[PDB]
Amino acid sequence: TKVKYPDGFRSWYHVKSMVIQPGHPLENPFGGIHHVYANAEAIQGLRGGNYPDGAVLVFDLFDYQEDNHALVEGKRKLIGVMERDAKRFSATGGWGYEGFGEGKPDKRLVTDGGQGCFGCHAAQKESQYVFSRLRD
Amino acid sequence: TKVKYPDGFRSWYHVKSMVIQPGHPLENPFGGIHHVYANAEAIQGLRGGNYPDGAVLVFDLFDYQEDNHALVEGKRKLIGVMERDAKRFSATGGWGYEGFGEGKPDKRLVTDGGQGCFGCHAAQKESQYVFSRLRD
Ligand code: HEC
Ligand code: HEC
Ligand SMILES: [Zn+2]
């Protein structure tokens, strides 16, 4: 019933990025520069196919530093992970939700079975609970 | 002696990202959110090896829109490309420098055989003319 740490996710396909700055409603706790990654199974779902069990999406969140009209990546704050298992994660729409503090496998963050994560993602039911869109 | 368009670069390894905001010395024409990509050959150099012939680094530059203090990726502005060939690009330290307007193969931006690009990158001679560092 646990989401696997997504070993090697830094080698995966870069889906998209966004910056959430102070003053944005999601400033706590999603503030910073985030990169979304997708393994091969997740790419099948993102392209408009279906998500196979074993699809993984990673939200990779960096702190940033203000450097002379540049925002520069600082320390990693955390990763968010969605792992596809239609049966095992059926309580949260077939995705298991987990967070890892500083992206460390030993700092698991989710305490409520991912119901809190799923509460927000449920708005995206029509895109299989995934916000991110594939871009060129 | 033209740099090849780096077909499939969006499937390559994501090295790092940075935001260049208005007022930055490099705003014209590098302003926006950029993502650095490396093919397998360029990863050998970024890890501390010699960059092999065929190494390619891509600077993928997106415009952004600030919306409620989120910076949201907009349209691709351009890609910058560095292609390693010690012999064919000897005049610019063994890297060929090109830009592609909107990331399109038909929109070549470099008009001076890459001397201006090389002029700034020459400061990084000790790291084989590459600014970006591998991060985990
Ligand atoms: C809104 C109130 C949210 C809560 C709570 C959670 N997430 Fe979420 N997530 C949200 C948005 C708006 C986005 C898109 C970001 C973008 O750049 O467009 C995301 C994205 C993810 C991703 C990437 C896949 C996707 O759906 O786009 C993952 C892997 C992810 N989120 C995981 C996650 C976890 C583990 C959370 C709770 C423990 C969680 N999210 C809460 C909005 C919201
Ligand atoms: C300084 C005055 C610059 C000029 C002119 C050019 N580039 Fe450059 N480039 C510069 C910096 C500071 C960086 C690093 C950005 C980061 O996020 O740290 C870069 C990066 C690139 C990359 C990525 C590889 C790397 O060296 O880090 C490429 C592929 C690249 N630049 C290409 C490029 C081309 C094609 C240019 C002119 C035609 C060019 N650059 C000019 C600084 C400067
Ligand atoms: Zn200033």
Q: Is B52 exposed, middle or buried (0-12, 13-18, 19+ CB in 10 A)?
A: middle
Compute the distance between CA of residue A64 and CA of residue A32 in angstroms, rounded to an integer: 6
The residue of chain B with its CA nearest to that of A31 is B70
- The contacts of residue B123 (CB under 8 Å, 6+ apart) are none
User: Of B11, B18, B72, which has the smallest distance from its Cβ to A70's Cβ?
Assistant: B18
Inter-chain CB proximity B35 and A19 less than 8 Å: no
Nearest Cα residue to atom 37 of ligand 1 = A117
The one-character DSSP state at A125 is G
Secondary-structure percent of chain B, ordered helix, strand, coil, rounded to 5: 20, 35, 40
Q: Is B72 exposed, middle or buried (0-12, 13-18, 19+ CB in 10 A)?
A: middle
Which listed ligand is nearest to B30 at the C-alpha?
A: 2
